[PDB]
């Protein structure tokens, strides 16, 4: 009866145990019911189908805005964090997004209390509160969340895009919004938010515009007694589905050129295509089809042949969405000092590809190969996370059957030329929108976009440039892409070995490498996962050796990318990054052609042959990178200078930057084979494969470096790790710097605590699941201090400790004594509550640390995590958990009296301050709780005096793991 | 590659170095 249909089978993928049930209720609302009787976590998400662009033009941000406030309280929960509170005290979360067609709420939470959150979760749609406090208070946090994307470049051009196209169209609202637009001007304009917030809730948040989906251990029967018994009470106001048929790019929209200046210093060249909606055409993608070809990275590809002529590094294309009614077409790239000079020709180049694809007209083989790819892809998909997986459904119900719905993004079915030729003959000069972005700019610009305040200039397009475009000819230097010979054919899951161990076994041991095996006994996919950590003491010897490891290996991937791309296309992946250590090296994806994959890579990079003129572009764009960095957020900066400051060896960014001028091509030729020269290798091969294929593929890795490398074991005194600054009783030191780029402040505060142990870490994790929640609901719910409030463990070398981080527009020391005053709430807050809410706690952390990966790479990083923490504690969810439950209300009062009390005889403080723009002074030190008084804390003016003056702690000693 | 709007969130968990 509630029930107005019950869809057919869900299509899933043969290799998905878990149960789907779709339906839609007689309000309207388009279900996914999903019974996993093994999740550890239960998740439920509900998606609106309105957003930003439903805005009334006159309260700009309206939808953002009721998104932040329906999680402040309803009728039937008032309290405004009951539902947090609800979700922290039995390890759940919680958060939601605002987009220009969609508002989607989700969270997860143990299984055993769906119900529970559900309810509370249900009542953001049925009797939100809006209370008036509350929306004087939370307009701040959205105040402040856009305040930290006004120097955001993204950002930036995201919403100077929206002010280049029809004025008069949806596109060029502002859908942020910010105290001026929420709160100053509608105070002007005589307007009442609070009930703007109702009646815009009240007239868009319709059953007939809702789809949910709810994730549990119940059965599909049970789900659906709950879900209908929640969520049929919803309201239908039979609200018509918001459509844009107009494109917000009209003629007098196109043939322009945009000259834009950035706040990082980058170099970019932004192509734009306007193309009708082609959101129907999903069964054979026409948008996709030409994306493939045209941002394809293999040979003959036109990326290929803009980085060879030295123009451009990257490059993206393929549509971008819009809106219902209207979608773009994209072809961006990032541009040399050399590219810049030569956009015109970039241009050129690119139609000179897009007439290619003209002239070979579509190929159908392509449309095969990938429509295969994609069919492997889904039978062999990765179990998703619950919280990401309902949310993502939530939103794709709406634009899909619900027997389509795991399959509709997914599988290929029908190859259309027609349509493909339809969107090509879309992509020509006559439709055409190119920006620049480049400091270059800066100065020569004559507008102003008002919200963000992007400086730019926008030209016509010459008609001579347009008609040369027009007439692009075929360039032979473009063809399509090869038969892709990485597509995986061996899926085979190899039988469980009778030696096979649930957790890595050591399986060699020896001064060249120590290998970790593990065959997945739990998955049973045909993945694998490759990870290699290579040890040489030359890859951070100084700033010098660590700019040389990165451009090495940076160089590497470079040459191996039309190579590689093939490979990541069929499912094959890598990554190759310097560490402090020296290397790291990861190959996951189908186990079939991995060991080809690997082979080359070792072979590579220990043969390698620098391209002088890459070597110079990649440079200077390491250059840029480094100095970008100042553009970065003052948390960012906070966490930079923490780290910098507690580890016993670290170069700053400006220290890399002085020493990249002398690094020269000789130099780093020199360099490569005396990083390889001596090596330590430890990895972790864990997937669908054997002790002996293992011990294989270690072998050929050792036997390749030694033939081409001459590679020799290292000393094991070598091996060497670096140790946290240890900090001195009582003691607080504060260390503060300036963002010449945010006009806002930032803040750090790290209590060290002790070494990791069993003990301590449960000591620390226990207390900071307990103020975990609080510490929101104080610092930014309550005070507001900033969007950015957290809390949290840091772990780091073997040492750990709390640490705060806070963005405000208010003053560090402010901010300072605000942390300080929750700390005295906590403990007050601790001493009085019930061994039920305590125990309750205890609970919570337990089955957060006991939740069970979902794929194999999420088991593999764990396993991975020990190793290279080198504390090797496999079973250490079991143990610490068994130890957490013994911890009682007392143990974490004294815990804190001694450690992190203000008054504690162990206290270990160091805060980080970082100033807003406009500040040139601040001192270090300064209705609400009481803050404590603080002690004048040591200013450190040179981090190197700093550690210099310190001892340091010990490393944690390994977790002994006998084996062969 | 082939490219697969900027949408805003209710909070940022986890803070990370970037």
Same mark, same amino acid.
């Given at each position: 009866?509630?029930?107005?249909?019950?869809?057919?089978?869900?299509?899933?993928?043969?290799?998905?145990?878990?149960?789907?049930?779709?339906?839609?209720?007689?309000?309207?609302?388009?279900?996914?019911?999903?019974?996993?009787?093994?999740?550890?976590?239960?998740?439920?998400?509900?998606?609106?189908?309105?957003?930003?662009?439903?805005?009334? =033009?006159?309260?700009?941000?309206?939808?953002?805005?009721?998104?932040?406030?329906?999680?402040?309280?309803?009728?039937?929960?008032? &309290?405004?964090?009951?539902?947090?509170?609800?979700?922290?005290?039995?390890?759940?979360?919680?958060?939601?997004?605002?987009?220009?067609?969609?508002?989607?709420?989700?969270?997860?939470?143990?299984?055993?209390?769906?119900?529970?959150?559900?309810?509370?979760?249900?009542?953001?749609?049925?009797?939100?509160?809006?209370?008036?406090?509350?929306?004087?208070?939370?307009?701040?946090?959205?105040?402040?969340?856009?305040?930290?994307?006004?120097?955001?470049?993204?950002?930036?051009?995201?919403?100077?895009?929206?002010?280049?196209?029809?004025?008069?169209?949806?596109?060029?609202?502002?859908?942020?919004?910010?105290?001026?637009?929420?709160?100053?001007?509608?105070?002007?304009?005589?307007?009442?938010?609070?009930?703007?917030?109702?009646?815009?809730?009240?007239?868009? *948040?319709?059953?007939?515009?809702?789809?949910?989906?709810?994730?549990?251990?119940?059965?599909?029967?049970?789900?659906?007694?709950?879900?209908?018994?929640?969520?049929?009470?919803?309201?239908?106001?039979?609200?018509?589905?918001?459509?844009?048929?107009?494109?917000?790019?009209?003629?007098?929209?196109?043939?322009?050129?945009?000259?834009?200046?950035?706040?990082?210093?980058?170099?970019?060249?932004?192509?734009?295509?306007?193309?009708?909606?082609?959101?129907?055409?999903?069964?054979?993608?026409?948008?996709?089809?030409?994306?493939?070809?045209?941002?394809?990275?293999?040979?003959?590809?036109?990326?290929?042949?803009?980085?060879?002529?030295?123009?451009?590094?990257?490059?993206?294309?393929?549509?971008?969405?819009?809106?219902?009614?209207?979608?773009?077409?994209?072809?961006?790239?990032?541009?040399?000092?050399?590219?810049?000079?030569?956009?015109?020709?970039?241009?050129?180049?690119?139609?000179?590809?897009?007439?290619?694809?003209?002239?070979?007209?579509?190929?159908?083989?392509?449309?095969?190969?990938?429509?295969?790819?994609?069919?492997?892809?889904?039978?062999?998909?990765?179990?998703?996370?619950?919280?990401? *997986?309902?949310?993502?459904?939530?939103?794709?119900?709406?634009?899909?059957?619900?027997?389509?719905?795991?399959?509709?993004?997914?599988?290929?079915?029908?190859?259309?030329?027609?349509?493909?030729?339809?969107?090509?003959?879309?992509?020509? =000069?006559?439709?055409?929108?190119?920006?620049?972005?480049? &400091?270059?700019?800066?100065?020569?610009?004559?507008?102003?976009?008002?919200?963000?305040?992007?400086?730019? &200039?926008?030209?016509?397009?010459?008609?001579?440039?347009?008609?040369?475009?027009?007439?692009?000819?075929?360039?032979?230097?473009?063809?399509?892409?090869?038969?892709?010979?990485?597509?995986?054919?061996?899926?085979?899951?190899?039988?469980?070995?009778?030696?096979?161990?649930?957790?890595?076994?050591?399986?060699?041991?020896?001064?060249?490498?120590?290998?970790?095996?593990?065959?997945?006994?739990?998955?049973?996919?045909?993945?694998?996962?490759?990870?290699?950590?290579?040890?040489?003491?030359?890859?951070?010897?100084?700033?010098?050796?660590?700019?040389?490891? *990165?451009?090495?290996?940076?160089?590497?991937?470079?040459?191996?990318?039309?190579?590689?791309?093939?490979?990541?296309?069929?499912?094959?992946?890598?990554?190759?990054?310097?560490?402090?250590?020296?290397?790291?090296?990861?190959?996951?994806?189908?186990?079939?052609?991995?060991?080809?994959?690997?082979?080359?890579?070792?072979?590579?990079?220990?043969? %390698?042959?620098?391209?002088?003129?890459?070597?110079?572009?990649? &440079?200077?764009?390491?250059?840029?990178?480094?100095?970008?960095?100042?553009?970065?957020?003052?948390?960012?900066?906070?966490?930079?200078?923490?780290?910098?400051?507690?580890?016993?060896?670290?170069?700053?960014?400006?220290?890399?930057?002085?020493?990249?001028?002398?690094?020269?091509?000789?130099?780093?030729?020199?360099?490569?084979?005396?990083?390889?020269?001596?090596?330590?290798?430890?990895?972790?091969?864990?997937?669908?494969?054997?002790?002996?294929?293992?011990?294989?593929?270690?072998?050929?890795?050792?036997?390749?470096?030694?033939?081409?490398?001459?590679?020799?074991?290292?000393?094991?005194?070598?091996?060497?790790?670096?140790?946290?600054?240890?900090?001195?009783?009582?003691?607080?030191?504060?260390?503060?710097?300036?963002?010449?780029?945010?006009?806002?402040?930032?803040?750090?505060?790290?209590?060290?605590?002790?070494?990791?142990?069993?003990?301590?870490?449960?000591?620390?994790?226990?207390?900071?699941?307990?103020?975990?929640?609080?510490? %929101?609901?104080?610092?930014?719910?309550?005070?507001?201090?900033?969007?950015?409030?957290?809390?949290?463990?840091?772990?780091?070398?073997?040492?750990?400790?709390?640490?705060?981080?806070?963005?405000?527009?208010?003053?560090?020391?402010?901010?300072?004594?605000?942390?300080?005053?929750?700390?005295?709430?906590?403990?007050?807050?601790?001493?009085?509550?019930?061994?039920?809410?305590?125990?309750?706690?205890?609970?919570?952390?337990?089955?957060?640390?006991?939740?069970?990966?979902?794929?194999?790479?999420?088991?593999?990083?764990?396993?991975?995590?020990?190793?290279?923490?080198?504390?090797?504690?496999?079973?250490?969810?079991?143990?610490?958990?068994?130890?957490?439950?013994?911890?009682?209300?007392?143990?974490?009062?004294?815990?804190?009296?001694?450690?992190?009390?203000?008054?504690?005889?162990?206290?270990?403080?160091?805060?980080?301050?970082?100033?807003?723009?406009?500040?040139?002074?601040?001192?270090?030190?300064?209705?609400?709780?009481?803050?404590?008084?603080?002690?004048?804390?040591?200013?450190?003016?040179?981090?190197?005096?700093?550690?210099?003056?310190?001892?340091?702690?010990?490393?944690?000693?390994?977790?002994?793991?006998?084996?062969? | 590659?082939?490219?697969?709007?900027?949408?805003?969130?209710?909070?940022?968990?986890?803070?990370?170095?970037?």
């Amino acid at each position: 009866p509630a029930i107005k249909r019950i869809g057919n089978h869900i299509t899933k993928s043969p290799e998905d145990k878990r149960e789907y049930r779709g339906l839609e209720l007689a309000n309207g609302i388009k279900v996914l019911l999903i019974s996993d009787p093994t999740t550890d976590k239960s998740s439920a998400a509900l998606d609106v189908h309105i957003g930003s662009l439903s805005d009334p =033009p006159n309260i700009a941000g309206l939808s953002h805005f009721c998104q932040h406030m329906l999680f402040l309280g309803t009728k039937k929960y008032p &309290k405004e964090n009951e539902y947090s509170q609800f979700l922290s005290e039995h390890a759940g979360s919680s958060n939601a997004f605002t987009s220009g067609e969609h508002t989607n709420y989700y969270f997860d939470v143990s299984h055993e209390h769906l119900e529970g959150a559900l309810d509370r979760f249900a009542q953001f749609f049925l009797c939100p509160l809006f209370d008036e406090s509350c929306k004087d208070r939370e307009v701040n946090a959205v105040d402040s969340e856009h305040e930290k994307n006004v120097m955001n470049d993204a950002w930036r051009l995201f919403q100077l895009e929206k002010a280049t196209g029809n004025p008069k169209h949806p596109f060029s609202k502002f859908g942020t919004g910010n105290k001026y637009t929420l709160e100053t001007r509608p105070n002007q304009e005589g307007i009442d938010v609070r009930q703007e917030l109702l009646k815009f809730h009240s007239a868009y *948040y319709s059953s007939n515009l809702m789809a949910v989906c709810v994730l549990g251990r119940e059965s599909l029967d049970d789900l659906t007694n709950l879900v209908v018994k929640l969520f049929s009470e919803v309201e239908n106001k039979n609200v018509p589905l918001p459509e844009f048929p107009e494109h917000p790019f009209q003629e007098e929209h196109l043939k322009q050129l945009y000259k834009i200046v950035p706040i990082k210093d980058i170099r970019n060249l932004y192509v734009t295509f306007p193309i009708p909606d082609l959101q129907k055409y999903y069964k054979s993608n026409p948008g996709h089809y030409l994306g493939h070809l045209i941002g394809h990275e293999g040979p003959g590809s036109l990326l290929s042949e803009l980085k060879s002529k030295g123009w451009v590094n990257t490059l993206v294309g393929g549509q971008k969405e819009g809106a219902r009614g209207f979608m773009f077409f994209i072809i961006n790239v990032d541009l040399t000092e050399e590219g810049l000079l030569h956009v015109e020709d970039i241009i050129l180049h690119m139609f000179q590809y897009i007439q290619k694809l003209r002239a070979e007209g579509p190929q159908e083989w392509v449309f095969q190969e990938c429509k295969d790819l994609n069919a492997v892809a889904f039978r062999f998909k990765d179990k998703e996370r619950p919280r990401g *997986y309902t949310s993502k459904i939530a939103g794709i119900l709406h634009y899909y059957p619900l027997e389509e719905v795991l399959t509709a993004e997914y599988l290929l079915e029908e190859f259309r030329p027609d349509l493909i030729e339809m969107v090509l003959d879309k992509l020509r =000069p006559e439709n055409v929108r190119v920006a620049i972005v480049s &400091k270059s700019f800066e100065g020569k610009t004559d507008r102003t976009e008002e919200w963000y305040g992007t400086q730019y &200039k926008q030209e016509a397009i010459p008609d001579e440039v347009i008609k040369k475009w027009q007439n692009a000819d075929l360039n032979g230097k473009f063809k399509l892409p090869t038969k892709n010979e990485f597509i995986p054919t061996n899926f085979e899951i190899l039988p469980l070995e009778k030696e096979a161990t649930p957790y890595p076994a050591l399986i060699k041991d020896t001064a060249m490498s120590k290998l970790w095996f593990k065959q997945d006994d739990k998955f049973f996919l045909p993945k694998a996962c490759l990870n290699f950590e290579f040890f040489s003491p030359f890859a951070y010897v100084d700033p010098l050796h660590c700019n040389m490891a *990165y451009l090495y290996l940076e160089l590497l991937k470079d040459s191996l990318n039309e190579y590689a791309y093939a490979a990541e296309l069929a499912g094959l992946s890598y990554d190759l990054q310097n560490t402090i250590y020296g290397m790291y090296l990861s190959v996951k994806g189908y186990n079939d052609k991995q060991p080809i994959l690997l082979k080359k890579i070792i072979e590579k990079m220990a043969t %390698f042959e620098i391209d002088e003129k890459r070597f110079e572009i990649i &440079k200077e764009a390491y250059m840029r990178s480094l100095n970008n960095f100042r553009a970065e957020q003052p948390h960012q900066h906070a966490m930079y200078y923490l780290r910098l400051l507690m580890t016993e060896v670290a170069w700053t960014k400006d220290e890399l930057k002085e020493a990249l001028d002398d690094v020269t091509l000789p130099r780093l030729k020199a360099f490569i084979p005396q990083l390889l020269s001596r090596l330590h290798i430890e990895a972790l091969l864990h997937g669908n494969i054997t002790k002996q294929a293992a011990l294989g593929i270690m072998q050929m890795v050792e036997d390749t470096l030694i033939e081409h490398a001459h590679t020799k074991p290292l000393l094991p005194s070598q091996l060497v790790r670096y140790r946290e600054v240890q900090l001195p009783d009582r003691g607080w030191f504060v260390y503060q710097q300036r963002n010449e780029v945010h006009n806002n402040c930032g803040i750090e505060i790290y209590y060290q605590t002790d070494m990791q142990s069993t003990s301590e870490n449960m000591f620390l994790e226990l207390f900071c699941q307990i103020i975990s929640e609080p510490c %929101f609901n104080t610092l930014r719910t309550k005070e507001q201090l900033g969007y950015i409030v957290f809390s949290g463990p840091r772990r780091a070398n073997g040492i750990q400790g709390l640490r705060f981080i806070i963005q405000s527009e208010k003053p560090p020391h402010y901010l300072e004594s605000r942390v300080e005053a929750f700390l005295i709430t906590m403990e007050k807050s601790i001493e009085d509550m019930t061994e039920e809410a305590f125990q309750k706690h205890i609970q919570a952390l337990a089955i957060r640390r006991l939740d069970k990966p979902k794929k194999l790479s999420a088991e593999c990083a764990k396993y991975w995590g020990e190793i290279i923490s080198q504390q090797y504690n496999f079973d250490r969810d079991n143990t610490e958990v068994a130890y957490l439950k013994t911890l009682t209300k007392e143990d974490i009062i004294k815990f804190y009296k001694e450690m992190l009390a203000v008054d504690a005889p162990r206290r270990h403080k160091v805060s980080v301050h970082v100033l807003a723009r406009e500040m040139d002074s601040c001192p270090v030190v300064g209705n609400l709780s009481q803050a404590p008084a603080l002690p004048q804390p040591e200013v450190i003016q040179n981090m190197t005096e700093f550690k210099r003056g310190l001892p340091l702690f010990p490393l944690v000693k390994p977790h002994i793991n006998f084996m062969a | 590659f082939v490219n697969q709007v900027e949408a805003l969130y209710l909070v940022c968990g986890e803070r990370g170095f970037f």
